[PDB]
């Protein structure tokens, strides 16, 4: 109990998700609640992530250096064409892949689907703050302590309010999000560093449960990853004239 | 836990009719155009409207039915601008042939236009008030309804002859199979906030001075903005903000 | 009417071949509360939507277009369901189901004698989701993959796909030579909301016939239904029929090919709003076919997607790999307009042979 | 889930041909208190497991192998039991019956007109007895000598092996033209557990279709379910499919042969444990056909036995002497591994004749 | 913020009289508001560090609809402080020139690294102009200085400051754009549909 | 877990396998057993500590 | 509230001088309280130090190194002629200079009039 350490942070509790759906400490065998509808006059059924919305998965390590600038950096996670979330046996591409629709819940006034942990640890002489931005937008920002943990549910990118070119009506009216286009993305930045001459790197990991993420129309498994030609997404959001 | 909804407070109203038309009735019950023969109408008797743009209560009426508006709010960003900012603002157009039509467009003001600005999609209703001054020798007999398709499609509306009632006035609810269209696009096809006028006869002197002018009101009335537009995470600064220190000599 | 009956979590495998489509129905977006029931007499004329020859082995897709379509029962210039969207603008469904708001059911018959024998698969997509519906047309998945996949065996000794009507006729036909007449009236006046049988369609089965039959949804984001013909090449709301005709073999013990059946269809399902009156733009119900299928913009590399996850599509020489060499020649194409028809994918010309299709359609 | 019905002492002809399995189920070394239901909306696809045609008086085996299988009715690579594989590690069965603890059910159905008819005979052995279904594979036993067979007559004018699926929509297809949608919903929401007939199926019988359907057995000393594929090589676990084919005239008093079939199957009754990430080693689903048998070390003279005591094995000309001399040029082959295939037995070459294939085969 | 934290009054708190008798008042009262920061290294012992306040972008839209204004102010003050930390810090509010000094804090970051202030609007006009102020007010900057470094030879010194600013209640006066015109955007109006 | 402020950290790795009674010294293929696997995510450690830790 | 550092002292009520002539953190406007007599008979008045005691005012800066012999050292403060403590405006030098005598209080036994503050702050090396 006696050691000298520099870890501690919010003791999520704090933290507002729903700590049932994204369970803090579930038991080694049991199953993750079903998560809360966006309104009550959509359709439900039972949930099929209630497994894997058990486990933080290893999703991209980012490096926390003294920063130069003051820009934004992109984190994008597309978890229906990715090779990292679709490996073998219990992947995260499998609820994408068995489903017509997809949604999130409404709990904090938009939608926000995918949720994200960002765990630091650190030695005790570097301090500093890591912001994290829920979405491209100028939405709600998460604090991230070095030397602490939180986690970050995340807005799609189609709903984000902006007008891209693709831009459809279903995408501002309706909460269901056709799966394949359902990438999430985060921005994060450094706020504040202090350093001393003995570390200056500071490597973290971003874990990447699917919290709070809900399906619709059950089809069967389609195939897991697509090995022929990856130029298909630009003659899927770009649409020439 | 929901973020917190946030409010602002405009105080005393920009453009405010506050000496109004004495020819537009007040209540229902000094209302008896249609039971004569001076308003024939297809949609029903004029409801009472209260706006807070025009300072005394009026009749109106229902050119399409009032319903709920469902405001779909999943999307970053929700605004109720709400009657703030909002007139009633005029134009003048002359009466059409007998066998043409007037598409009357809805108008709205600067400051609307600027707050409204900060979003991408909206839905409004709107209202109207129709002036026609009658001098002696007026036998028009005018027909006013709201248009659908094309330009040749004809609904339920209402007849009146403006020599017995100067003043009619209206209100058109948002109508359209989306909610909340894109601010500057808007559904193909779509009936928005526009009313026809169209004339039925002219039975007139040969004195008075036809093709007599038509004076419409106009007001977007309560207005729902979704979608939040500018992703600025800059910081900005003006001067009154700041600390100016005392030069030195 | 047309109600929406809470199914339990589990679907009972001896009913039930798919899963449930929902738990719950899906009647967010539409404004239920919005027009005013219109019960005329000539709702209740069904329409003869498709009628002929249907091959087996393959899904047969029947665009349900209810504002443009053509009776084949009928010789005039409307029909029953057609004249609904002349009249009025905005048609606006009682209420709803798994896949969106249901304005009508269709129904699939097929008078057979005993020496023929096989099962019809029939699933009606919304449109919303086209994909799902072109991908079972090229045969790159089947119907039993997709939730809502009914399977209903016409043989037969069987009694399955028929149709007895038994005439509304207020006398009840009590003065019948040798027989009675089931379930036409002086039986039992049984109610459109209520489902019983009469009480002489309980021992006859012959006239009871049970039927081959879904539903008809539109799509989850549309308020009402309102039809302009240029949106709704962009974002499509009308369904889209898949039937798919499996084994029929004969005595012979022969496999047929291109058995005889013919839809029907009843939009009763929806409130009115808006009557229009001289209109000059009507929904134009094209003369003695059919509409097509829209394929819009948005929807390419859905299409693109499934042919490049198929092992079948790249081996030549099989219906697939036709159907995506037509696919990769119109997307090399020129294309004024924002979508593409099936129509386009069937009557395309032929190159040679896959790989230089795609080489040549990531430059345009 | 899937109960454990007790039967009475002594069977009932009129339903039964066999006498019972058990009298009870045999839960012991399987490990019921251990996972969690895990109940996503994937599990309620069917899978077709086997689609084709099968030839007429002789059993046909269909390795029902759950971990490595595909579907005929869906074009990806993975499907809905197989995937259930890829996840989790371990697959807990709920309830057992009188061969071992059971997975799931199967389903035969044959869409046949009524110029045909036959009879099915149909078992599906645990696979910790594979010479039950070997000796039966090769003509050298019947399946009517064994525990848990049915037979059921497929003809006809007999509505027994058909599907009828009536689509799960919540509208319950409320208006259809001229009859009714037996089954489907606003019917009746017939429970999982429950054994009910809704109220619509009981007049109608045609859409009713008395099934052909079994279990899934796997095996009476495993714990749970956990698939390595070298270790089930050498102590087969899951079961296989014997299905026969017996009579089978046509109108012309002629016997016929090879009738088609398919099979589906589901596996709805496990539980899960140990959901796995990012994995190396899958259960590997072999694309487009099927697994095959594997026939382990210690089961050899037991296949050895059943042809020795078999007085049509030993003379020439006949099939089960066809398959005894390439049961015994296998056994005299170099073998590194300690199984053979069925295959093994099927594609091998020929010598002369009987007993000097014994004699070489004591040598080594 | 979201959770509740306590501030050093660098000024006493007050009631800040509103006069509104022109044309146009509005109470903008933390709309469009939020904790802005800003990255400082740490003065030498004679010099001085003043950190002028910020504010959105979309507070300065909704308040460039006005001419004069008056606001509080908000601070939050952090310095890591590694391990070798002697800094002793200074933080107070400017009054006319380079050199007043006021009463304000004193404060040891390695014992307390976050420090928060409280500014409010002291000024002898009330509504001054947002782009010009009154010559001599003191607005809501505050100074930072520093005291002593009693630091290791390790320690990377001139210590970083991070300081959060943010532009608390504000109530605007004098309504700005005498425009009577009219204006039209096309999600308003009514689009019919194409001819062929 | 990050040894800095939790030294210490203790498990409990219960008997699971689909064969109960292994063999002792042959065992089943592709068993658990009583192993557990250490793996190092960050190494944000000074230049001064003697890492691998 | 997670950093490694040294500091922490007495807590300033345990000390001896009298905590509301000298106040610990006064409210930013308000005025210190009137201290105490030396003896009851000596004349008496209202104030003219309120405002001055609520200010710590910086006056010399020491330094603290190694020490080699052990004699001590001595900080003259002269509040009436030192130019640190007569700038402009309000400073300390403004009670002296308004007046013809000076006294302080007798709590401890001894007149004791002007307070000094040590504040240390020190990395934990």
Known sequence: ?????????????????????????????????????????????????????????????????????????????????????????????????????????????????????????????????????????????????????????????????????????????????????????????????????????????????????????PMKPDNNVDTRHFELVEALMYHYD | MQ??????????????????????????????????????????????????????????????????????????????????????????????????????????????????????????????????????????????????????????????????????????????????????????????????????????????????????????????????????????????????????? | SLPENAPNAVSNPQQFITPATALSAEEYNVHEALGETEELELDEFPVLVFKGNVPVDSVTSIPLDLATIYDFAWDGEQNAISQKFQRFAHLIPKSAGGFGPVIGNYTITANLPTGVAGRILHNCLPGDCVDLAVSRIFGLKSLLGVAGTAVSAIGGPLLNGLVNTAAPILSGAAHAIGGNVVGGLADAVIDIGSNLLTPKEKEQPSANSSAISGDIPISRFVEMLKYVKENYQDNPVFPTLLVEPQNFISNAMTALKTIPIEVFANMRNVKVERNLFDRTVVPTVKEATLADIVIPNHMYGYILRDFLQNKRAFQSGTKQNVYFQQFLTVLSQRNIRTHITLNDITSCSIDSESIANKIERVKH
């Not at chain 1, 939608?111 to 030695?123: D, K, Y």
Request: hydrophobic fraction near 40%; include cysteine.
């Open chain 2, 3 to 249: 973020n917190p909804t946030q409010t602002m407070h405009i105080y005393d109203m920009p453009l405010r009719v506050i000496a109004g038309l004495s020819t537009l009735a007040k209540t229902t019950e000094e209302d008896d155009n249609t039971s004569t023969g001076i308003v024939v109408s297809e949609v029903g008797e004029p409801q009472v409207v209260n706006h807070p743009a025009w300072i005394d209560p009026f009749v109106a009426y229902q050119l399409r039915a009032p319903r709920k508006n469902i405001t779909p709010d999943f999307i970053f960003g929700r605004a109720d601008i709400g009657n703030a900012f909002s007139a009633f603002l005029p134009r003048r157009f002359s009466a059409p042939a007998v066998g043409t039509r007037l598409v009357v467009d809805p108008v709205f003001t600067y400051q609307q236009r600027t707050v409204l600005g900060l979003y991408n999609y909206f839905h409004a209703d709107f209202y109207y008030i129709v002036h026609v001054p009658a001098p002696l020798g007026t036998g028009i007999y005018l027909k006013i309804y709201a248009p659908e398709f094309d330009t040749t499609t004809v609904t339920r509306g209402i007849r009146f002859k403006p020599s017995a009632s100067p003043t009619i006035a209206l209100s058109v609810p948002w109508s359209n199979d989306l909610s909340t269209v894109e601010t500057s696009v808007g559904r193909v096809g779509q009936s928005g906030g526009s009313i026809v006028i169209e004339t039925i006869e002219d039975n007139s002197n040969e004195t008075v001075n036809t093709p007599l002018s038509i004076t419409v009101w106009c007001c977007m009335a309560n207005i729902k903005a979704t979608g939040y537009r500018h992703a600025d995470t800059s910081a900005y600064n003006e001067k009154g903000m700041n600390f100016i220190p005392v030069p030195v000599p």
């Open chain 1, 1 to 217: 109990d006696n050691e000298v350490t520099a870890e501690g942070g919010k003791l999520v509790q704090e933290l507002v998700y729903d700590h049932s759906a994204i369970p803090v400490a579930p038991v080694v065998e049991t199953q993750a609640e079903q998560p809360e509808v966006p309104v009550s006059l959509v359709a439900t059924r039972k949930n099929d992530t209630g497994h894997l919305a058990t486990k933080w998965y290893d999703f991209a390590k980012i490096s926390l250096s003294n920063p130069a600038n003051m820009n934004w950096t992109t984190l994008t996670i597309d978890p229906y064409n990715n090779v990292t979330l679709s490996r073998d046996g219990e992947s995260m591409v499998l609820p994408w892949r068995r489903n017509v629709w997809t949604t999130g819940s409404k709990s904090i006034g938009y939608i926000r689907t995918m949720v994200a942990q960002i765990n630091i640890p650190r030695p005790p002489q570097i301090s500093g703050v890591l912001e994290v931005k829920d979405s491209i937008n100028n939405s709600s920002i998460s604090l991230v302590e070095f030397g602490g943990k939180v986690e970050i549910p995340i807005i799609p990118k189609v709903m984000n309010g902006l007008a891209t070119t693709a831009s459809l009506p279903r995408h501002r009216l309706n909460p269901w999000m056709r799966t394949a286009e359902s990438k999430v993305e985060l921005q994060y930045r450094i706020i504040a560093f202090n350093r001393t001459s003995d570390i200056a790197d500071l490597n973290v990991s971003v874990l990447l449960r699917p919290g709070d993420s809900q399906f619709q129309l």
